[PDB]
């Protein structure tokens, strides 16, 4: 649209010159008009469209059916929106004529070949923004966005279904090729964080993609080796970090070298930008497709039940250091291909690998929340969340690499949780979130030891307060209800609870209605928090699918008091509640439906 | 927005701290009574109790009134005094049913109010009215905020000048601040962009100032030696680069570590949050202050030329341009010049970045292009062909370059050149009509067309080079040269299109100097000296005197370029060079009002 180029005639020999299909040529003299010069004309053979425009004003007028008065301040505009088969196969002359001489003064001769030039990727615009003003200099985020995608598949056999196609149209005379260059080429800065490997010779064939924009390969003159298409296949290598934008570049430059006792002198460039998939968590609300376990010659049972839920969520179960704990799960997507990522500090073909090292502890210390609104700001694939440390704590919970590699994803800003408290310091100790048909689609599940307090006051009053627990030592409702220490710590893991609990209502939007209390009572091991019970809270969501650890609680009229109270909480949301006995994993989960780059960070 | 949440017992007084500011959700911890169905709240004076259902906005007074027992009703409580000794207030809950004269149960909760602030200058004189304000943001734009870090070097005298100032303001109970931290923090990515030392003892003392937050110094606790107030002195260490946003952040954190058996708890975090100041650059149309020359034995008539000209401009001379350039790095209370290198130190930065193995460097005006708004210029860099084998201008210079953000550079054509530097064929100058400025740019046409019209003219026999010599007509008829110096043409025609693109201008904002060229190897040198390559101190001009046709006892290209500059106001001076940098004033737009 906005390009045009300069082209300057001369009155003493005929001017050749080179233009793009698309971009417009400004056709000024080099050098006096003639002596008495007062009128002009423009002529040009089929396929120059000649217009007449004011510098100063906008809007063009045809050119070639009038006599024009000349004015220094007019401007002619010549466009060649169709290429040439030979050399220098179209013309334009203006003739400069004066009110005496009959015949003109003089004649400036422009002949012109004309190229079509285009660098084109996937833009990803299907209705976002109306194309014919999408600048290729551009990535936009939002509704209204375009711009290319590039994925990452680790950070030659035949695995280029991932790697973005990048098309190079020059459709021109031949010859005119010989006397200019077409160099490909991009930053120093983006060649380290991507590749491309231009197509030469049989689709068939592996090796027929030549290695031409390297690491420290920044140009590359690109032979017409297919006639007037060129294809070229762009995989990237970095993800996002606190030093990459996550854009890559790529130019096209034509370059006249025609001139040899001169230099050479660009023509014309397009481009085409890649934005780097994000790497995107997927939180518990998403529907599961295959679990992962590790299991030993002891663990024979936990397996059996959770190969049980597995197939009454319809997902699917497979088994294998842990996958839990130095392992997590999530997604890059593109329009053409969503692929599953696995994050780490052999379990699939579809599978990329990400890992970053320390610059100088578990997994467990991160989680995601559902889509949520919060502060005005909208987070469609919901927020990190990453159990931190106190101020001034020796050993740091979560690296400042892995820190830095969340925030430069953007995409699901992460929040700080207090967990020094914990034993371990997992949030899925006292976190989880379960699918919820009203409210904002989920609930938060929060361990709660006030809760469990306040049910076991409840049965206590209700004659049955020397109902016994780890029933299948034994210990009653009274004897806890009655020990000072354990109940005062447990109020001290409450008032941990509660900062969490605020921070999360807060930063995720979320009000006392879209919280449950989940009974749950704690005990000091060593001066930090572990489940006097097993953990009701740190269960598994497979979809309406729950499996939640057994916690072995009274038995009054015959049922476990602590399994009744969380299916009383938790099945009229319409989950079904499986106990899973592990006091004697890491799940792979569809996409969300909303599109990244649809987001506007 | 802050609320905190304790928790209270029926069979203990429960105890807490809380923040002024920060309002507190009192809700129980167990069961309530047992036939309970209504409750009351007293609370000391200074202790605001308000009653609010957790679903809905809105609080209302609570110490006037028995309500019904809801569980869905929260206790909020306000102090927004402080306290002067542990526990000075308290608040009481007592549940009642419509049988028991009595109240079934008490609940106590002791509250002491301590008042914890970090804060810095927040620039927000008049575009922010401070209740919104979100200390964990600094926001660009005429609606904006933030703290402004400045950086006098970037690879303990008095240089606390430049330094940002942080108060804690700490008032609470003694006794209080001996079970509970005080933790300033930074994350290990900002500590090693940025230090900050505390004030320790009198300030005339220069060892008072203790480094307490450094590079591998993550974490301090605070010590109250001042009482309610401990000052902290801000030094940034590195500018915007490819890898840093250029954003800082401290923290302050009261802990709870009362507890010797539990672990230690977060109470209250403040944040303050400061932007490091881009180095912006100086186009030639601000005014000049300093002049920086560097002379030889012989060029005494240069320098003399120089020196009258930035007498007659007001500004000042002082005794390169190459591998080199001035700026300047501004905050609301100082604006400070730093050089970028590749005499001394009064009020001057340095900064310079090595390769990971100046003349290419100018910018242009304030402009609107795209839409856009460049209230600071846009910067121009000369390029290599993508082709070339050499680089002119180094990968991390572009990346610190793009990094300032406040003017997004423009590329250039300028391989054919010998040298290479825009300023051969690139000008600005100020003009009063039309635009701030009017851009000059050689043109071996315009000079092709004054020799044409002074051949018609019959002094086609004037001689160039006079005061070897070469005339008029020999010029015009040298066919090589007339062709060489029209590819030269359309080589500034390229950078004419992508300057008239990328900073908005139209044909009337340009003036065609007329210069010619010729071939050193293969590349472009002046053909007589280069008038565009001039020298801006205001109004004045020093224009490299050319030695071309004298008619009629004037030197026509001298009195082209007069005719050219004069009616815009300048007063163009001609030095003979044929036989330098500029320190100038900031721009009055702030760089924190541009929203990039």
């Given at each position: ?178 006397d ?75 370059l006249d070298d025609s001139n040899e006792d001169f230099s050479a002198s ?336």
């Amino acid at each position: 649209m906005s390009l045009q180029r300069i082209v300057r005639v001369s009155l003493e020999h005929p001017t050749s010159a080179v233009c793009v299909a698309g971009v417009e040529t400004l056709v000024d003299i080099y050098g006096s008009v003639p002596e008495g010069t007062e009128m002009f004309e423009v002529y040009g053979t089929p396929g120059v469209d000649i217009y007449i425009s004011p510098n100063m004003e906008r809007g063009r007028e045809r050119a070639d059916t009038r006599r024009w008065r000349f004015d220094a301040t007019l401007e002619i505009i010549v466009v060649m929106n169709s290429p040439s088969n030979d050399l220098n196969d179209s013309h334009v002359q203006i003739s400069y004529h004066s009110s005496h001489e009959p015949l003109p003064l003089a004649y400036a001769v422009l002949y012109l070949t004309c190229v079509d030039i285009s660098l084109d990727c996937d833009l990803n615009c299907e209705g976002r923004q109306d194309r014919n003003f999408v600048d290729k200099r551009q990535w936009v985020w939002g509704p209204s966005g375009y711009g290319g995608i590039l994925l990452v598949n680790c950070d030659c056999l035949q695995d280029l279904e991932d790697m973005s196609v990048m098309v190079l149209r020059t459709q021109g005379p031949a010859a005119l090729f010989d006397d200019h260059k077409l160099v490909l080429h991009t930053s120093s800065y983006d060649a380290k964080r991507a590749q491309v490997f231009h197509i030469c010779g049989p689709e068939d064939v592996c090796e027929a993609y030549r290695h031409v924009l390297g690491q420290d390969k920044v140009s590359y003159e690109v032979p017409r080796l297919h006639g007037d298409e060129e294809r070229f296949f762009v995989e990237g290598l970095s993800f996002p970090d606190a030093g990459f934008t996550g854009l890559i570049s790529f130019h096209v430059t034509l370059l006249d070298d025609s001139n040899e006792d001169f230099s050479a002198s660009p023509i014309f460039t397009d481009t085409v930008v890649f934005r780097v998939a994000p790497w995107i968590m997927t939180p518990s609300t998403l529907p599961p497709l295959e679990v992962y376990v590790c299991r030993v010659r002891n663990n024979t049972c936990f397996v059996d039940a959770v190969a049980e839920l597995a197939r009454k969520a319809g997902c699917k179960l497979t088994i294998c250091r842990w996958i839990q704990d130095e392992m997590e799960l999530g997604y890059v997507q593109a329009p053409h291909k969503t692929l599953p990522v696995v994050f780490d500090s052999i379990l699939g073909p579809d599978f990329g690998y990400v890992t970053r090292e320390p610059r100088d502890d578990s997994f467990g210390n991160l989680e995601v929340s559902p889509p949520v609104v919060a502060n005005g700001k909208e987070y469609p694939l919901g927020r990190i969340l990453i159990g931190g440390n106190l101020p001034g704590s020796s050993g740091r919970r979560v690296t400042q690499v892995v820190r830095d590699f969340l925030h430069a994803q953007k995409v699901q800003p992460p929040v700080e949780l207090f967990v020094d408290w914990l034993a371990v310091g997992h949030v899925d100790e006292f976190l989880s979130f379960v699918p919820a048909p009203d409210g904002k689609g989920f609930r938060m599940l929060l361990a709660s030891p006030g809760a469990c307090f306040k049910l076991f006051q409840e049965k206590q009053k209700c004659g049955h307060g020397r109902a016994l627990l780890f029933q299948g030592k034994t210990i009653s409702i009274n004897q806890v209800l009655s020990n000072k220490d354990l109940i005062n710590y447990n109020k001290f893991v409450q008032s941990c609870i509660d900062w969490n609990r605020e921070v999360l209502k807060r930063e995720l939007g979320l009000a006392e209605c879209d919280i449950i209390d989940i009974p749950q009572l704690f005990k000091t091991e060593r001066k930090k928090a572990t489940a006097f019970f097993p953990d009701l809270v740190n269960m598994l969501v497979l979809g309406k699918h729950l499996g939640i650890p057994k916690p072995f609680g009274p038995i009054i009229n015959g049922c476990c008091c602590l399994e009744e109270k969380v299916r009383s909480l938790l099945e009229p949301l319409g989950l079904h509640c499986t106990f899973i006995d592990d006091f004697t994993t890491n799940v792979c989960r569809k996409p969300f439906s909303f599109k990244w780059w649809n987001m506007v960070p």
